């Protein structure tokens, strides 16, 4: 599979250096080695040929002193790292060689690595992805984050209720990570601010300690290696005992585990806020010790010896661009400001002026529970200083806006960045707008959305600040990585360009007609059904039939995301078999699966609506083969690239106006599968690419739904109306799902029935009827399988690279390569 | 020197990985490596030459099956690994020429290693001399223990005081050990016993895990390299979130930290008891975790295949033998007690014969503050199985007792496990003898002493259990290492072979009359004085006179090892100088250093006297070059390498009876130092070895305190007849070492006056008279250095390979070999 090249010479190098690694680093003998140390001796000699390029990578920007851009995010859904570190580096074929030789199978290997799940849902995945296309465009980025010692947690069903369990991903070790306690930085906690004569001096502080440690980001076949740098907290060694702190020297020792806390676990809470003193601690511990090593690098570099002008900012912002990836960094801009005006001494509005211009902020939801608004009785005690630069911030932008709209006194309501009333609070959104140069949301959509209705205000003030940046995908672990037998039958007609230029999937609209590529596609998969399928039986228990329409939706469990319109689908789709038992249907094995944050009742609670169904309808004898229903235990990205290929519809049906994008939707796309949707988030744009005729859309659009809200939207007209849903929800209330306990599902039906605010009963009659146009193509294998080409050939747009080329030209100023750094190592 | 060959071929394989190891292990460039990234690169390149012959030495273990010695001890006190690993592989001189060719002094690198200070005093470190001893002799031993995350504590001197700080050792990595996350095992703590039908169940337990961590132990020069196995405590990762365990998700997540406590820290009490739980909780961790790596092994080996027993443990103690390092692993033997009766289902009585000619106990003080009674309270709640076991242990025992002295009541009284009386305790000392086949002291005074007054009553119940082995010292670190001038020297006159046979180190008798020798003895002796002195300038501030008599005592600072009867030594040396000022006098360097546990109120106020000394005698002008007192900041294993080196007179003076052995006192008798002592521990064999002639002996001897203590021990006596204590007891009440606080040391005046146990007025005048003797002698540097070479030439019997070789055979029943075992590796 042209995975690259599989030669003899590197197939020997290979072999002995995974020997080397066996006995000399793992320290294991063949006579003992388990697969684990088998991985690991594998996962090491990877690593060995990457370090050549990192080092040389960072050495070269050393000299060649690029604009260098830091993404601050404090989630980094990485995933595995091997088979994706063997595909940018083109080791794949050889070292399945090398391991068919030792006798192992590389693919057993590769299900050995756990993900590195330092991310809840698609806003962490994003940054991982766009960090591969930032190292695939050349571009000096950096990745900034925390490294959790537990990453979201491992969801298991018993019951049919969600239990969840740690995630102790680093169990084991990590062989990519290269800690680096040369460049701890302490971070500076509570203290109190004395105004004295030159300015404030914030005294009094708790140290933490935040300890680097890297991970290489190598890029796709180009040779160059970026850096995923990642804090650990640790505890002073001194301050922990050191006052006149007596309290019992052991127990002062047994103390520094709270101060390491702040990355003992990643917040499982997928975008909502939540005001926890800990959260508010890693979001300023990030940035504080990323803005050290940001300064470090800019005053070491070649302004390193640029001697006589005092040591100046002016060409920060030519040399720094930092984007704040959702609110959970904004600190940056206050401490940006803490830094500059307090420690450097530059005058306040210099130092903005160098701020706004470094700075720019992804919006990612328009849903008002995401937002933040820390309250400012925790910013008072935890972060003084910044209280008040937060406070000068303010005020000076609403003394803008008040010179700008004169007299509009609830301007300057809406707009300041402090939510009075009760417990009054900071917005964290308003803060980013006004200290960023840049401010985009994530589909078009979700930004006209941003610029009409949240952030209007902001944009009259400021339109020029407002852009928007449509999401995107990488090709490689979400094309070449999970879907290879796609991927080589995509190459052999057009070649293999179109790995880093996905928009060449295009040419492939030549060949909708042609029979041989047809056969190959639905062959792709077919095969693929096949292999998900045995991974269903063989890790979990299951028989389900290959030959069904794959329907799956799988994403964080939430009610916009309306998995529930897919239960109400599903069970109409099992009394519908249930009344006329002996009608021909076409067969569908729906899986639904994510993760519920722990605590969101009702997320908990559709989990087990899932359950119920599957254990009813999976056991009557009268549907059969016919519908399978399954929930996907423990979604996350590595079970994302098993169940992605092997899907036929993609479920993206939000409440249009609540998804800002959506990122698997992209994934689907690619890998063949055909998407029912509503018209929110970047289905839009993957709908205009395609066309419409080649896409499910149903449901209403935006405006209705605002027409609707203005009318009342009152669920009981549906119930009313609609003789099959009012049969699905006499059944939920009667206990047909819950035998033993009817009472159970009463939470769900009350709040379809009376405080539902995604209305999942006014998309239902859309929603079924489209579906019925499912199945009815699903039965013409022929013009499915070209709808699929139709939608594969126009996938292109929804390359990260795409979106960071334009991140790049539009608000970091920097220009794309994909020109191929030199790198080999050294050899002498 | 030789420190062995140097030699082409080697020098260049060396770099070679010196190299491989900076870029790909530390992924460092030499453009930005610093001298702790060099000691990186160089540790992993001596670790690499020791991994072959390690898993050898285990393989080979395995098929040869031998009986399997496990030192179990809470402590172990390794020191730095480098050069000794060097030392003992014979690559030292290998390396010094290679980190030459590549421009770098080794010896800075070997300055960049932090200490395993895994140990406090002479308990820790004599587990560290047995573990090289053991590799030496070839005997498949291994040492368990636990990982402290944070070691003995550093103890910074401000103002006097002792700081404590953390040790925070394993900060940058520790390039020796490897994980072993393969094998952890759970440790069940609390619970419940049901005891129905077959027997008793430990039911409803919290699970704590072990995880191991393997260092390598390399034989001197003979390729034997054994395991040292320190366990981690590792919370279970499902039921800190399971039950119905709601308390926040993320909180459960944060508690995990508390069941890691368990090796969070080392307890710094310096051999005295604290009944604190999470001591409990490791000292049962240990235990059990090894038992089961124990049980694990006999029946893997061999028994691997011997079928149709049952399973049998008829062979376990000619298969295994453990030896308890003092009483902190005790509940080895109820533990053994709980897995063959409660597990493996053996009859009670067999169970405990296989126990007790498994088991075997090291006693090492007769002090009774050090000794450990649990509260039957505690027991009770953490482990009531173990409980149980004591009781029916005890039972049995006294029915023995009973039997055999019939009708003496009090002896059942004395002898029970059970201390009865307000609070309930179980006196762990008691436990041991009772299950232990061997009981020995480690001194031949302390043994007596162990038979006539503490165990007496277990001596008349069985004598044939109570043993002696005098402690010992290894020559390789303590002679070899730290003292390479020294052993060149010897080694020119005597060959090597000295280094695993130190008895020959008397064929130096030959050489007390020879004048090149002399010579020789003595410039050592002086440059060994000049590299400290740069150090102590160097490191700290100091001009001290190096022609001085380098008089010290280095050991914790305890009552009983009588820092204070030094101190006194000292101004009554300082007030001789000051009342007839131009008198000549032998300079001396005084230095005293020594951790002091925190809390010991006396200890810490003992160290700021010295402190008080010195500030007061430094500075005085007219004593000049005439007396200098140091402190010396931070002693640790180390400390012990740079100021046993240039010592003359070796300070050994606890009240005849207190101390055990003392290991402190064999490494200055090798090294050259003439020793200044009482009749105790071990002195009183130094002094038949080398001659009552050749040692400086004061004091009351054992049975004169026993005297003493029958008529009523008074101060008071003291300080009436003898003038020089009166004024020195004067200054102290006065102020004359506080000025501003005058206050201040009546504290200590008040326990010499009131309530000194440890009888130091008594031993003064001697004391002083006897230090006028040194004085007289080192005038005349010919006879001083020929008493020295009187003394190393007889400090063959201290070296610990005589010490394991006599465990092996009189208590384990195992042969030594020097027998070199053939490992290099592969090579294919
Ligand atoms: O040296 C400069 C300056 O420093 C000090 O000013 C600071 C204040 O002392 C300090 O309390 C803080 O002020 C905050 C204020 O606490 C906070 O609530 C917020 O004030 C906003 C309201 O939130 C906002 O609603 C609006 O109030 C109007 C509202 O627009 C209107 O629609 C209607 O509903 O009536 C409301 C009542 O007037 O505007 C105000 C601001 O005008 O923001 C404030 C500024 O961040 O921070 C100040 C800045 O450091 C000194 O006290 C001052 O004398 C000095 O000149
Ligand atoms: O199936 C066997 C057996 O099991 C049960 O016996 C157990 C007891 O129920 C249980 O309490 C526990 O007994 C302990 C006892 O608690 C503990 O205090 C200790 O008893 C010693 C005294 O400590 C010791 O001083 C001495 O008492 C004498 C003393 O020698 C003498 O000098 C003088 O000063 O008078 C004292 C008062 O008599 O001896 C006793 C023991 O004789 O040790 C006990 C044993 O460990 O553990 C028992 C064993 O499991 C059942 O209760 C029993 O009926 C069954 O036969
Ligand atoms: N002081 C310096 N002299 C030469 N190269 C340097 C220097 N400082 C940093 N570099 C190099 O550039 C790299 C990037 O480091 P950093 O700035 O920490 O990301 C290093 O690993 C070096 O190769
Ligand atoms: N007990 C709670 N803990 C955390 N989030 C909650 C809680 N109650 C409501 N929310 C949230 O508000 C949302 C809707 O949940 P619900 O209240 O069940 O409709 C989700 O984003 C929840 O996470
Ligand atoms: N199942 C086995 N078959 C062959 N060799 C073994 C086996 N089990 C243990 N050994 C070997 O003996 C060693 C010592 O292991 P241990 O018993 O854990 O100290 C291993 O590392 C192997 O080389
Ligand atoms: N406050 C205390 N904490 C710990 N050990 C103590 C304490 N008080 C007395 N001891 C001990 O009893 C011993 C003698 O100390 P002292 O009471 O100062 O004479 C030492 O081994 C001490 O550690
Ligand atoms: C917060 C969020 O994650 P999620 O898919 O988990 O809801 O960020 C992603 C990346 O910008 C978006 O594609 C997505 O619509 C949005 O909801
Ligand atoms: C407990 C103890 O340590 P220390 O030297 O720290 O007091 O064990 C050592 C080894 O058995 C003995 O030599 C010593 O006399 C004894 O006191
Ligand atoms: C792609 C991906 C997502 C994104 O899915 P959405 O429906 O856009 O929220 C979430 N989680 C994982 C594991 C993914 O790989
Ligand atoms: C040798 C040694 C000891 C033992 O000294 P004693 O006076 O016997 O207690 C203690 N600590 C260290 C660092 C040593 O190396």
Redesign the interface.
Known sequence: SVRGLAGVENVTELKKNFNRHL??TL?K?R?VA?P??YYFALAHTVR?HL??R??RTQ?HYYEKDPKRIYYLSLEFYMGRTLQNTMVNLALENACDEATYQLGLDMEELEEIEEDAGLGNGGLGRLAACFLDSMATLGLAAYGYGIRYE?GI?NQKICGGWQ????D?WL???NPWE??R??FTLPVHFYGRVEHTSQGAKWVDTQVVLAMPYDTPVPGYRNNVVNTMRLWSAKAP??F???DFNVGG??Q???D??LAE?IS??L??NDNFFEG?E?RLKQEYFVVAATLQDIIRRFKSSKFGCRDPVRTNFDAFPDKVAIQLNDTHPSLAIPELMRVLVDLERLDWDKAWEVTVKTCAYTNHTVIPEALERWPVHLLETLLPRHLQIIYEINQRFLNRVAAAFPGDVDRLRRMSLVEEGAVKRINMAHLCIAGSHAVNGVARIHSEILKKTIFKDFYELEPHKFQNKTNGITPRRWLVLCNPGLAEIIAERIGEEYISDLDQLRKLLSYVDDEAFIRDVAKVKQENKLKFAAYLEREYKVHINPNSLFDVQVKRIHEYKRQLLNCLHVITLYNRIKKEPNKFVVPRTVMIGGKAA??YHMAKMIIKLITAIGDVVNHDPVVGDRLRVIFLENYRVSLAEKVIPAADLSEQISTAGTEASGTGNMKFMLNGALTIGTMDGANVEMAEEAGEENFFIFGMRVEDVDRLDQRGYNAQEYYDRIPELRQIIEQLSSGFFSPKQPDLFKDIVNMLMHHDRFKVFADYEEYVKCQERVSALYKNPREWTRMVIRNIATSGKFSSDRTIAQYAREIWGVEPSRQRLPAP??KI
């Open positions: 006995h000399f320290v003998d006579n388990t684990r140390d060995d370090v050549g990192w080092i050495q537990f947690f239990m969840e369990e740690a102790d169990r084991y070790g290269k800690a306690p040369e060694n001194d922990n005992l050191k020297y052991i002062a020792v047994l520094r585990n806390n003992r676990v917040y499982p926890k800990l722990p605590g190592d050294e």
